[PDB]
Amino acid sequence: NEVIKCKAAVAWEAGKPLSIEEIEVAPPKAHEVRIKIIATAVCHTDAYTLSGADPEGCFPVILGHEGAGIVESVGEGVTKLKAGDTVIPLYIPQCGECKFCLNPKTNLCQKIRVTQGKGLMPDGTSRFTCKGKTILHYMGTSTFSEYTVVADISVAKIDPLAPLDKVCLLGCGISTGYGAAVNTAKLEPGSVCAVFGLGGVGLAVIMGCKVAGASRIIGVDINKDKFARAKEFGATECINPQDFSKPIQEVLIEMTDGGVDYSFECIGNVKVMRAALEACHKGWGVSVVVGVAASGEEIATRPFQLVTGRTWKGTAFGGWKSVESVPKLVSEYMSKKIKVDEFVTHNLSFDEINKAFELMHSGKSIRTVVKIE
Amino acid sequence: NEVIKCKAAVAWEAGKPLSIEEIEVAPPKAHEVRIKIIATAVCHTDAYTLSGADPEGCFPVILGHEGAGIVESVGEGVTKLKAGDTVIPLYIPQCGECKFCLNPKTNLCQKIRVTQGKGLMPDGTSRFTCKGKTILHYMGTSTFSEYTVVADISVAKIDPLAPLDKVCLLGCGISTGYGAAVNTAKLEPGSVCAVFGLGGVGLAVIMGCKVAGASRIIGVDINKDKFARAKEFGATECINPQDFSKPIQEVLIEMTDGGVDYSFECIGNVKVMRAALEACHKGWGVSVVVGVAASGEEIATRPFQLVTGRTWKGTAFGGWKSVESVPKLVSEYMSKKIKVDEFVTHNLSFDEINKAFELMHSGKSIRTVVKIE
Ligand SMILES: NC(=O)c1ccc[n+]([C@@H]2O[C@H](COP(=O)([O-])OP(=O)(O)OC[C@H]3O[C@@H](n4cnc5c(N)ncnc54)[C@H](O)[C@@H]3O)[C@@H](O)[C@H]2O)c1
Ligand SMILES: NC(=O)c1ccc[n+]([C@@H]2O[C@H](COP(=O)([O-])OP(=O)(O)OC[C@H]3O[C@@H](n4cnc5c(N)ncnc54)[C@H](O)[C@@H]3O)[C@@H](O)[C@H]2O)c1
Ligand SMILES: Cc1cc(C(N)=O)ccc1-n1c(CCC(=O)N2CCSC2=O)ccc1-c1ccc(-n2ccnc2)cc1
Ligand SMILES: Cc1cc(C(N)=O)ccc1-n1c(CCC(=O)N2CCSC2=O)ccc1-c1ccc(-n2ccnc2)cc1
Ligand SMILES: [Zn+2]
Ligand SMILES: [Zn+2]
Ligand SMILES: [Zn+2]
Ligand SMILES: [Zn+2]
């Protein structure tokens, strides 16, 4: 119930490294929760915002949107979570009252997004003070800190037995891939699937396709060093566009005799998205867009590709309804139905957080986990 | 069983009028049917091919792909249809054996399309002789003639009580609109729908939406003279893009509080297709492409429109399985469930066939019916 002094990794300008500093964190107001972050993961959109390319970037700011922790304080009006619980913050809440929350077809809650995009709590202010300045929040969580304040609808409650040093990855990547495979596509047994890109999201998609029951899975990438891991996750074969003179969709059409049944696009390249649409089977093919492109880029095609059967669709947070569905995923990981331990490729300490970004800049890791205690 | 002399409307070069001539029609070979055309309808793709803009146009050729008639002769191996029957030719057959015919998700049979696109019968030759030249077939039917020869899988058998002078329209237009409404979209009661363009296909789509059970229907067009008929078919309101300074998708978003549930695009303009995608509701919107664009045009959008929920899909022949589904549509018209008599706007004789095209060039008619006897 009093201001907490803690250590954070603040960013001050676009394109500069993060600097470790001491910050003051205010007590939560009505309908808010204070969380001590235990572990976190460094995602790609964090580095994208840090670079400064985002037209909506606001500085100074504390990044991070993947982590798990333990509750200390709750505001006035909270009757759902008490101190000592193990929880996961979420950048897609679930109020349960709006028109988007009563529709089973969607999961895009639209209650606090106007303040979340500006970097402020729902009341209209920020809880982070540094040397007489106010530091904005990032994507509603801000987990690059030892303590953080979030809204009461952005918190999911998990089993206390879960290891918090690895279950944190179920915030952005593994959940998105698994949901893309088993929610937005809903693929029947015996299908043929193709995955573009073999990062964290691609490997999660491959895992979901193998779990659901597809017979043949094709992995596509321009870096050979990934192929090995793909074959461990369930991909039957892997190809490289640079080894063929013909365009990639023609290679896939020749290989699969007509085209694949499902194609997942997990990169963020508009040309790859067009190639992914044109490689689906005529009559019943489906293409799912998972990655996010830079602002100002357009994906083109001819309407003759849609008239003869094919479909575009897209997914955000794998289509899961976050608050009521993340606990089920943690339970699934308890039963060894899905793989979480095989995604983490590196471990760092808090002070070396900058090093994490450099690894992401080189393409040598899938996911890195930072221990914040 | 002998060559038949008949009257036809042959085209000799791109951009010239059709000329009425006398032709010889050969007896059918194995797995073929000879039909005496009674009535026909002039569609938009006929005039498109006649203009010469089609990169695949081949001349001389006999156009037409909508009509009903009576059988005279059948080839060797036909045990399904006998002479005197009332039938409808179809530009999408149904063999029932290929991989596309055993899949309930599609209706694009791929058995005789290679010869159909070239203008020849499956054996490899044409049955139309004129003054020592061979005349190719059009879209597998060629109904601008008093007698025509078609394959045995391109014929649907209907109730003999049907009036053949109006049931012919169930070949291309009304079927496509009705199927787009109730097959590819599958819209639930209480939905909001928007239709772009108010020709024959647009009015069929409106009829299907009203039958299925949507509550609110919005018609969009740039010609005011159409709006009246739309209000008779079930459209609740109609708008004109030229009356507003803002782009049309913003007008629709403001009007419907977020966007429509379903949007059908029935024109063939790539800019209208983009505007139709951007006017669907966030989270659960769907956009169905029905019209065909000119070769070399691309429809563009940003992937942020697909990531947040929306979908493109397309339809050819309304998704009906032609041979087994057209008789059901004729039965539906017998019970007054659907409207066929309200589409025909003009009637002509065979010799005035050219006049029909001129009407289509002015936008004063929905469908014109030519009586061929
Ligand atoms: N919509 C969502 O909810 C959501 C969630 C998480 C991530 N994402 C996005 O998914 C994308 C993947 O991110 P990530 O960190 O999981 O993996 P990553 O971006 O680090 O890996 C990208 C892979 O694509 C390959 N690549 C580059 N150009 C290629 C080309 N022409 N052809 C084939 N491969 C090419 C690269 O070699 C690489 O293996 C990102 O853009 C991310 O923003 C979206
Ligand atoms: N895929 C299929 O199976 C199939 C079947 C039949 C027809 N079609 C196609 O459907 C299209 C419609 O053909 P039709 O004969 O039924 O009607 P039509 O083409 O004669 O009517 C077109 C209407 O769109 C309007 N238009 C032009 N520009 C516009 C704009 N910017 N905004 C709004 N309206 C505009 C016109 O005023 C007109 O009312 C055609 O392109 C046809 O080729 C497709
Ligand atoms: C565009 C956007 C901005 C923010 C922000 N903070 O600026 C947050 C979310 C989104 N965004 C929306 C629009 C807003 C929206 O629909 N919703 C629903 C509940 S609240 C909310 O954000 C749809 C999809 C996304 C999205 C963006 C990035 C990632 N991504 C990439 C890598 N890692 C994460 C995943 C999804
Ligand atoms: C591109 C095409 C050419 C021909 C031809 N004769 O050149 C015939 C059909 C198509 N086409 C296909 C590819 C081929 C195909 O999938 N199939 C399935 C069974 S056979 C066959 O044609 C998919 C959709 C269409 C199509 C084209 C025009 C119209 N349209 C417009 C106005 N009025 C009619 C409707 C559909
Ligand atoms: Zn909500
Ligand atoms: Zn992320
Ligand atoms: Zn078939
Ligand atoms: Zn037609």
Side-chain angles (χ1 to χ4, degrees), chain A residues 169-221:
Chain A
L169 262 64
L170 278 192
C172 190
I174 295 90
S175 303
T176 308
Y178 193 87
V182 309
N183 276 330
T184 311
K186 295 183 289 289
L187 62 86
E188 314 96 357
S191 297
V192 187
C193 309
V195 192
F196 285 74
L198 292 182
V201 178
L203 294 178
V205 169
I206 277 171
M207 191 216 298
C209 277
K210 183 183 177 181
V211 162
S215 70
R216 193 169 180 207
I217 302 165
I218 304 158
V220 186
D221 188 342

Short mmCIF file of all heavy atoms in Angstrom, two decimals, chain A residues 169-221:
data_model
loop_
_atom_site.label_atom_id
_atom_site.label_comp_id
_atom_site.label_asym_id
_atom_site.label_seq_id
_atom_site.Cartn_x
_atom_site.Cartn_y
_atom_site.Cartn_z
N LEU A 169 6.25 -18.55 -21.56
CA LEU A 169 6.27 -18.51 -23.01
C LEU A 169 4.89 -18.69 -23.62
O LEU A 169 4.72 -18.42 -24.81
CB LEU A 169 7.22 -19.58 -23.54
CG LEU A 169 8.63 -19.14 -23.92
CD1 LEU A 169 9.37 -18.65 -22.72
CD2 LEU A 169 9.37 -20.29 -24.55
N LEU A 170 3.90 -19.11 -22.83
CA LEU A 170 2.52 -19.26 -23.28
C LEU A 170 1.79 -17.94 -23.36
O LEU A 170 0.56 -17.93 -23.33
CB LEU A 170 1.76 -20.21 -22.37
CG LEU A 170 1.93 -21.71 -22.60
CD1 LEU A 170 0.90 -22.46 -21.81
CD2 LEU A 170 1.83 -22.05 -24.07
N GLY A 171 2.51 -16.83 -23.43
CA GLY A 171 1.89 -15.53 -23.53
C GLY A 171 1.67 -15.05 -24.95
O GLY A 171 0.61 -14.52 -25.26
N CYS A 172 2.67 -15.20 -25.81
CA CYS A 172 2.58 -14.67 -27.17
C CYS A 172 2.80 -15.71 -28.26
O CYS A 172 2.02 -15.76 -29.21
CB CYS A 172 3.57 -13.52 -27.34
SG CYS A 172 3.37 -12.57 -28.86
N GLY A 173 3.85 -16.52 -28.17
CA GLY A 173 4.26 -17.32 -29.31
C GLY A 173 3.66 -18.70 -29.46
O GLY A 173 3.01 -19.01 -30.47
N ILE A 174 3.88 -19.55 -28.46
CA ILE A 174 3.40 -20.93 -28.52
C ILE A 174 1.89 -20.95 -28.60
O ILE A 174 1.30 -21.74 -29.35
CB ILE A 174 3.92 -21.73 -27.31
CG1 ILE A 174 5.43 -21.86 -27.37
CG2 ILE A 174 3.28 -23.09 -27.26
CD1 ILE A 174 6.18 -20.76 -26.68
N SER A 175 1.23 -20.08 -27.83
CA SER A 175 -0.22 -19.99 -27.87
C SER A 175 -0.71 -19.58 -29.25
O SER A 175 -1.67 -20.15 -29.76
CB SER A 175 -0.72 -19.00 -26.83
OG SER A 175 -0.27 -19.38 -25.54
N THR A 176 -0.04 -18.61 -29.88
CA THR A 176 -0.47 -18.15 -31.20
C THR A 176 -0.35 -19.26 -32.23
O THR A 176 -1.26 -19.47 -33.04
CB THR A 176 0.34 -16.94 -31.63
OG1 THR A 176 0.29 -15.95 -30.60
CG2 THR A 176 -0.25 -16.34 -32.88
N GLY A 177 0.77 -19.98 -32.24
CA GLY A 177 0.92 -21.06 -33.20
C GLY A 177 -0.07 -22.19 -32.98
O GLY A 177 -0.71 -22.67 -33.92
N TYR A 178 -0.21 -22.62 -31.73
CA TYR A 178 -1.11 -23.72 -31.43
C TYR A 178 -2.54 -23.36 -31.77
O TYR A 178 -3.28 -24.18 -32.35
CB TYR A 178 -0.96 -24.08 -29.95
CG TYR A 178 -1.58 -25.38 -29.52
CD1 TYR A 178 -0.89 -26.56 -29.61
CD2 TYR A 178 -2.84 -25.40 -28.96
CE1 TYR A 178 -1.46 -27.74 -29.20
CE2 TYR A 178 -3.41 -26.57 -28.55
CZ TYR A 178 -2.72 -27.73 -28.67
OH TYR A 178 -3.30 -28.90 -28.25
N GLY A 179 -2.95 -22.13 -31.47
CA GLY A 179 -4.29 -21.70 -31.81
C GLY A 179 -4.50 -21.56 -33.31
O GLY A 179 -5.56 -21.90 -33.82
N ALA A 180 -3.50 -21.06 -34.02
CA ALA A 180 -3.61 -21.00 -35.47
C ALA A 180 -3.84 -22.38 -36.05
O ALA A 180 -4.60 -22.54 -37.00
CB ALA A 180 -2.37 -20.37 -36.07
N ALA A 181 -3.19 -23.39 -35.48
CA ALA A 181 -3.36 -24.74 -36.01
C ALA A 181 -4.73 -25.32 -35.67
O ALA A 181 -5.39 -25.89 -36.54
CB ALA A 181 -2.25 -25.65 -35.51
N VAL A 182 -5.18 -25.19 -34.42
CA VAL A 182 -6.35 -25.95 -33.97
C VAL A 182 -7.60 -25.10 -33.74
O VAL A 182 -8.63 -25.67 -33.34
CB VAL A 182 -6.04 -26.76 -32.69
CG1 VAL A 182 -4.79 -27.57 -32.87
CG2 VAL A 182 -5.89 -25.84 -31.51
N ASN A 183 -7.55 -23.79 -33.95
CA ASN A 183 -8.73 -22.94 -33.77
C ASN A 183 -9.18 -22.26 -35.05
O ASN A 183 -10.33 -22.40 -35.45
CB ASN A 183 -8.46 -21.87 -32.71
CG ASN A 183 -8.69 -22.36 -31.31
OD1 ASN A 183 -9.53 -23.23 -31.08
ND2 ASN A 183 -7.97 -21.79 -30.36
N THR A 184 -8.30 -21.50 -35.70
CA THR A 184 -8.69 -20.74 -36.88
C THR A 184 -8.79 -21.63 -38.11
O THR A 184 -9.64 -21.40 -38.98
CB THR A 184 -7.69 -19.62 -37.14
OG1 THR A 184 -7.47 -18.90 -35.93
CG2 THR A 184 -8.23 -18.67 -38.17
N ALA A 185 -7.95 -22.65 -38.21
CA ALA A 185 -7.97 -23.56 -39.34
C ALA A 185 -8.93 -24.72 -39.12
O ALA A 185 -9.76 -25.02 -39.99
CB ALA A 185 -6.57 -24.08 -39.63
N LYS A 186 -8.84 -25.38 -37.96
CA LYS A 186 -9.66 -26.55 -37.63
C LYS A 186 -9.46 -27.66 -38.66
O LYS A 186 -10.35 -28.01 -39.42
CB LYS A 186 -11.14 -26.17 -37.52
CG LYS A 186 -11.47 -25.24 -36.39
CD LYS A 186 -12.97 -24.98 -36.32
CE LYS A 186 -13.43 -24.11 -37.48
NZ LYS A 186 -12.97 -22.70 -37.37
N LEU A 187 -8.24 -28.20 -38.68
CA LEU A 187 -7.87 -29.11 -39.74
C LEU A 187 -8.21 -30.55 -39.38
O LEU A 187 -8.01 -30.99 -38.24
CB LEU A 187 -6.38 -28.97 -40.07
CG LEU A 187 -5.28 -29.25 -39.06
CD1 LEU A 187 -4.92 -30.71 -39.06
CD2 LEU A 187 -4.08 -28.41 -39.39
N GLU A 188 -8.76 -31.28 -40.35
CA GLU A 188 -9.20 -32.65 -40.18
C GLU A 188 -8.04 -33.61 -40.36
O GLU A 188 -7.03 -33.27 -40.98
CB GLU A 188 -10.30 -32.96 -41.19
CG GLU A 188 -11.36 -31.89 -41.29
CD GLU A 188 -11.10 -30.93 -42.43
OE1 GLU A 188 -10.06 -31.07 -43.11
OE2 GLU A 188 -11.94 -30.03 -42.64
N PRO A 189 -8.15 -34.83 -39.82
CA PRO A 189 -7.06 -35.80 -39.98
C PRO A 189 -6.80 -36.14 -41.44
O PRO A 189 -7.71 -36.20 -42.27
CB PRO A 189 -7.57 -37.02 -39.21
CG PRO A 189 -8.52 -36.46 -38.22
CD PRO A 189 -9.18 -35.31 -38.89
N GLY A 190 -5.53 -36.37 -41.75
CA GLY A 190 -5.11 -36.75 -43.08
C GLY A 190 -4.80 -35.61 -44.03
O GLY A 190 -4.61 -35.87 -45.23
N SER A 191 -4.75 -34.37 -43.55
CA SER A 191 -4.55 -33.23 -44.42
C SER A 191 -3.06 -33.00 -44.69
O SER A 191 -2.19 -33.58 -44.05
CB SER A 191 -5.16 -31.98 -43.79
OG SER A 191 -6.56 -32.12 -43.67
N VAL A 192 -2.78 -32.12 -45.65
CA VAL A 192 -1.43 -31.72 -46.01
C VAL A 192 -1.27 -30.23 -45.69
O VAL A 192 -2.09 -29.40 -46.11
CB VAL A 192 -1.12 -31.99 -47.49
CG1 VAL A 192 0.32 -31.72 -47.79
CG2 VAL A 192 -1.47 -33.41 -47.84
N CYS A 193 -0.21 -29.90 -44.95
CA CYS A 193 0.02 -28.55 -44.46
C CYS A 193 1.41 -28.08 -44.86
O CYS A 193 2.34 -28.88 -44.98
CB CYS A 193 -0.13 -28.49 -42.95
SG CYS A 193 -1.66 -29.21 -42.34
N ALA A 194 1.54 -26.77 -45.08
CA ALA A 194 2.81 -26.14 -45.38
C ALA A 194 3.00 -24.92 -44.50
O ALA A 194 2.06 -24.16 -44.27
CB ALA A 194 2.89 -25.73 -46.85
N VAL A 195 4.21 -24.74 -43.99
CA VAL A 195 4.53 -23.68 -43.04
C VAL A 195 5.63 -22.83 -43.64
O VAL A 195 6.66 -23.35 -44.08
CB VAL A 195 4.98 -24.26 -41.69
CG1 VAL A 195 5.01 -23.18 -40.65
CG2 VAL A 195 4.07 -25.37 -41.25
N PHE A 196 5.43 -21.51 -43.66
CA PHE A 196 6.44 -20.59 -44.19
C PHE A 196 7.14 -19.89 -43.03
O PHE A 196 6.49 -19.20 -42.25
CB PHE A 196 5.80 -19.57 -45.13
CG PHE A 196 5.43 -20.13 -46.47
CD1 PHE A 196 4.34 -20.95 -46.62
CD2 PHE A 196 6.16 -19.80 -47.59
CE1 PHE A 196 4.00 -21.45 -47.84
CE2 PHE A 196 5.81 -20.31 -48.81
CZ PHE A 196 4.73 -21.13 -48.93
N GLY A 197 8.45 -20.07 -42.93
CA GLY A 197 9.20 -19.58 -41.80
C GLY A 197 9.26 -20.61 -40.70
O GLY A 197 8.28 -21.33 -40.48
N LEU A 198 10.39 -20.71 -40.00
CA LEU A 198 10.59 -21.74 -38.99
C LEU A 198 11.18 -21.13 -37.72
O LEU A 198 12.16 -21.62 -37.16
CB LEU A 198 11.50 -22.85 -39.50
CG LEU A 198 10.92 -23.73 -40.60
CD1 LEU A 198 11.91 -24.83 -40.98
CD2 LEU A 198 9.60 -24.33 -40.17
N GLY A 199 10.57 -20.06 -37.23
CA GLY A 199 10.92 -19.49 -35.95
C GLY A 199 10.12 -20.12 -34.84
O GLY A 199 9.73 -21.29 -34.91
N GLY A 200 9.87 -19.34 -33.79
CA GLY A 200 9.04 -19.84 -32.71
C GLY A 200 7.61 -20.10 -33.13
O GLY A 200 7.03 -21.14 -32.80
N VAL A 201 7.02 -19.17 -33.87
CA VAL A 201 5.64 -19.32 -34.31
C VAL A 201 5.51 -20.47 -35.30
O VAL A 201 4.55 -21.25 -35.24
CB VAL A 201 5.12 -18.00 -34.91
CG1 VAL A 201 3.72 -18.17 -35.41
CG2 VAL A 201 5.15 -16.92 -33.87
N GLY A 202 6.46 -20.61 -36.21
CA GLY A 202 6.41 -21.71 -37.16
C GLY A 202 6.48 -23.07 -36.50
O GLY A 202 5.75 -23.99 -36.86
N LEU A 203 7.37 -23.21 -35.52
CA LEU A 203 7.50 -24.49 -34.83
C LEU A 203 6.27 -24.79 -33.98
O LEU A 203 5.86 -25.94 -33.86
CB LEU A 203 8.76 -24.50 -33.98
CG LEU A 203 10.04 -24.45 -34.80
CD1 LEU A 203 11.24 -24.42 -33.90
CD2 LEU A 203 10.11 -25.64 -35.72
N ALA A 204 5.67 -23.76 -33.39
CA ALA A 204 4.41 -23.97 -32.68
C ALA A 204 3.31 -24.44 -33.63
O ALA A 204 2.52 -25.33 -33.29
CB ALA A 204 4.00 -22.71 -31.95
N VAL A 205 3.26 -23.85 -34.83
CA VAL A 205 2.26 -24.27 -35.81
C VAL A 205 2.48 -25.72 -36.22
O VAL A 205 1.53 -26.50 -36.35
CB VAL A 205 2.28 -23.33 -37.04
CG1 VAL A 205 1.47 -23.91 -38.14
CG2 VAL A 205 1.76 -21.99 -36.67
N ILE A 206 3.74 -26.11 -36.44
CA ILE A 206 4.05 -27.50 -36.78
C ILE A 206 3.61 -28.43 -35.67
O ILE A 206 3.04 -29.50 -35.92
CB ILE A 206 5.55 -27.65 -37.08
CG1 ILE A 206 5.85 -27.26 -38.52
CG2 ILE A 206 6.02 -29.05 -36.82
CD1 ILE A 206 7.31 -27.18 -38.84
N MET A 207 3.87 -28.05 -34.41
CA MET A 207 3.43 -28.87 -33.29
C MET A 207 1.92 -29.04 -33.28
O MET A 207 1.42 -30.14 -33.04
CB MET A 207 3.89 -28.25 -31.98
CG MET A 207 3.73 -29.14 -30.78
SD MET A 207 3.28 -28.21 -29.31
CE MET A 207 4.70 -27.16 -29.13
N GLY A 208 1.19 -27.96 -33.54
CA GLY A 208 -0.26 -28.05 -33.55
C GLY A 208 -0.78 -28.91 -34.68
O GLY A 208 -1.76 -29.65 -34.51
N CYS A 209 -0.16 -28.82 -35.86
CA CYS A 209 -0.57 -29.65 -36.99
C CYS A 209 -0.31 -31.12 -36.71
O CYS A 209 -1.13 -31.97 -37.07
CB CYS A 209 0.16 -29.22 -38.26
SG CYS A 209 -0.57 -27.83 -39.15
N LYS A 210 0.83 -31.44 -36.09
CA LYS A 210 1.11 -32.83 -35.74
C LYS A 210 0.13 -33.35 -34.69
O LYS A 210 -0.31 -34.50 -34.75
CB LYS A 210 2.54 -32.97 -35.24
CG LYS A 210 2.92 -34.39 -34.92
CD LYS A 210 4.32 -34.47 -34.36
CE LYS A 210 4.68 -35.88 -33.97
NZ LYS A 210 6.05 -35.95 -33.40
N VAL A 211 -0.21 -32.51 -33.70
CA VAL A 211 -1.17 -32.92 -32.68
C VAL A 211 -2.54 -33.16 -33.29
O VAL A 211 -3.23 -34.13 -32.95
CB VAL A 211 -1.23 -31.86 -31.56
CG1 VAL A 211 -2.48 -32.03 -30.74
CG2 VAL A 211 0.01 -31.95 -30.69
N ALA A 212 -2.97 -32.28 -34.20
CA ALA A 212 -4.32 -32.37 -34.74
C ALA A 212 -4.50 -33.61 -35.60
O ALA A 212 -5.57 -34.24 -35.58
CB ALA A 212 -4.66 -31.11 -35.54
N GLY A 213 -3.49 -33.98 -36.38
CA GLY A 213 -3.53 -35.24 -37.09
C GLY A 213 -3.23 -35.20 -38.57
O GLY A 213 -3.57 -36.14 -39.29
N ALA A 214 -2.58 -34.14 -39.04
CA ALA A 214 -2.21 -34.07 -40.44
C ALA A 214 -1.15 -35.12 -40.76
O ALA A 214 -0.33 -35.49 -39.92
CB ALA A 214 -1.69 -32.68 -40.79
N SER A 215 -1.18 -35.60 -42.00
CA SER A 215 -0.30 -36.68 -42.43
C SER A 215 1.03 -36.19 -42.97
O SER A 215 2.07 -36.78 -42.68
CB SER A 215 -1.00 -37.52 -43.50
OG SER A 215 -1.12 -36.79 -44.70
N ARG A 216 1.02 -35.12 -43.76
CA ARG A 216 2.21 -34.62 -44.43
C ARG A 216 2.40 -33.15 -44.09
O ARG A 216 1.46 -32.36 -44.21
CB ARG A 216 2.09 -34.81 -45.94
CG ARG A 216 3.37 -34.62 -46.68
CD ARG A 216 3.23 -35.08 -48.10
NE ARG A 216 4.47 -34.90 -48.83
CZ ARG A 216 4.55 -34.71 -50.14
NH1 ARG A 216 3.46 -34.70 -50.89
NH2 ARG A 216 5.74 -34.53 -50.70
N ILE A 217 3.61 -32.78 -43.68
CA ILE A 217 3.93 -31.40 -43.31
C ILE A 217 5.22 -30.98 -44.00
O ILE A 217 6.22 -31.69 -43.94
CB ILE A 217 4.06 -31.25 -41.78
CG1 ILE A 217 2.78 -31.69 -41.09
CG2 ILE A 217 4.36 -29.82 -41.42
CD1 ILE A 217 2.94 -31.91 -39.63
N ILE A 218 5.19 -29.81 -44.64
CA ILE A 218 6.31 -29.29 -45.42
C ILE A 218 6.77 -27.98 -44.79
O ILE A 218 5.96 -27.08 -44.58
CB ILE A 218 5.91 -29.06 -46.89
CG1 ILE A 218 5.38 -30.35 -47.50
CG2 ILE A 218 7.08 -28.57 -47.69
CD1 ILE A 218 4.52 -30.12 -48.70
N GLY A 219 8.06 -27.87 -44.51
CA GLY A 219 8.64 -26.67 -43.94
C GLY A 219 9.45 -25.93 -44.99
O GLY A 219 10.25 -26.53 -45.71
N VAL A 220 9.23 -24.62 -45.06
CA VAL A 220 9.86 -23.76 -46.06
C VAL A 220 10.62 -22.65 -45.34
O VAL A 220 10.07 -21.98 -44.47
CB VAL A 220 8.82 -23.15 -47.02
CG1 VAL A 220 9.50 -22.39 -48.11
CG2 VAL A 220 7.93 -24.23 -47.59
N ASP A 221 11.89 -22.47 -45.70
CA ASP A 221 12.71 -21.43 -45.10
C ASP A 221 13.94 -21.24 -45.97
O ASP A 221 14.30 -22.11 -46.76
CB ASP A 221 13.12 -21.81 -43.67
CG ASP A 221 13.80 -20.68 -42.94
OD1 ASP A 221 14.27 -19.73 -43.60
OD2 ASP A 221 13.86 -20.72 -41.69
#
